[PDB]
Amino acid sequence: PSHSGAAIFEKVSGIIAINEDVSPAELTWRSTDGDKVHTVVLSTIDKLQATPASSEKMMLRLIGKVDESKKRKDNEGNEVVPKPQRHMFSFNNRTVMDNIKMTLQQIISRYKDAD
Amino acid sequence: GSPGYPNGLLSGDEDFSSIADMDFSALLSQISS
Numbered sequence: 001p002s003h004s005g006a007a008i009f010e011k012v013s014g015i016i017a018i019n020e021d022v023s024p025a026e027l028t029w030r031s032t033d034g035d036k037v038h039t040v041v042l043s044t045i046d047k048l049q050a051t052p053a054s055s056e057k058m059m060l061r062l063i064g065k066v067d068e069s070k071k072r073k074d075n076e077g078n079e080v081v082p083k084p085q086r087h088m089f090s091f092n093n094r095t096v097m098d099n100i101k102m103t104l105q106q107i108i109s110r111y112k113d114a115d
Numbered sequence: 116g117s118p119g120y121p122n123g124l125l126s127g128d129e130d131f132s133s134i135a136d137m138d139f140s141a142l143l144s145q146i147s148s
Contacts, residue, residue, distance in 0.1 A: 010128055055142045059135075086139075088132055 002099050007060070008090035009038055016089060018103050025107045027062065027100075029089065040087055042107040049086070050101050053094045060097045062087035062104070 007016035009029045014036065019026040024043035030036065040062050047063030066084035074080050091097045123131065 049139055049143065051139075052142055054145070057138070057142065059139075061139060086132075086136065088135070 001103060002096070003103055005096035005100060006092060007096075007100075009088075012036055013090075016100060018100065018107075020103075020107070024111070027104060042104060043111040045104075045108055045111075046084060048101050048104050048108070050097045051091070051094075058091040058094075058097075060089040060091060060101065062089070 003018035003020070005016055007014060007029055012031060014029055014031040014034070017028045017030065019028050019039075024041050027040035027042060029038040029040075044065050045062055046065045049061040049063065051057040051059045064085040064087070066082060068081060070082065072080050072082060089097075
């Protein structure tokens with residue numbers, strides 16, 4: 001467990017930090033100095049997808065919570081279902097993303113049981 | 116060869132994560148045709 005490493009968001013390179021012992025745990029990206037900051041509250045997150053070590057890509061996705069029971073239909077009556085929003089983060093090593101996702105995954109599973 | 120600067124401002128910044136969402140589902144499964 002490290003909680004913090006190095007991540008890129010919106011082409012601006014920065015450092016990623018996980019927020020626990022706080023009000024519901026949040027994944028806080030900050031700029032390399034930290035003038036820019038983005039926050040992901042995991043009690044509002046449902047899934048997480050990261051680039052494999054076989055993948056050409058260095059990225060980490062964070063899937064948000066959407067209500068899919070509001071299924072919408074088009075003019076002809078075709079099923080058009082609203083999709084959840086995903087948050088990507090670019091990386092330089094697979095050993096970090098798997099360690100950030102590991103913590104994250106352990107945070108959402110707490111809000112997944114709801115006790 | 117020679118290093119260069121890639122440019123990708125044909126829309127904004129949030130227009131590349133919509134097509135790179137079709138990119139992420141082929142990586143975890145990976146299927147050859």
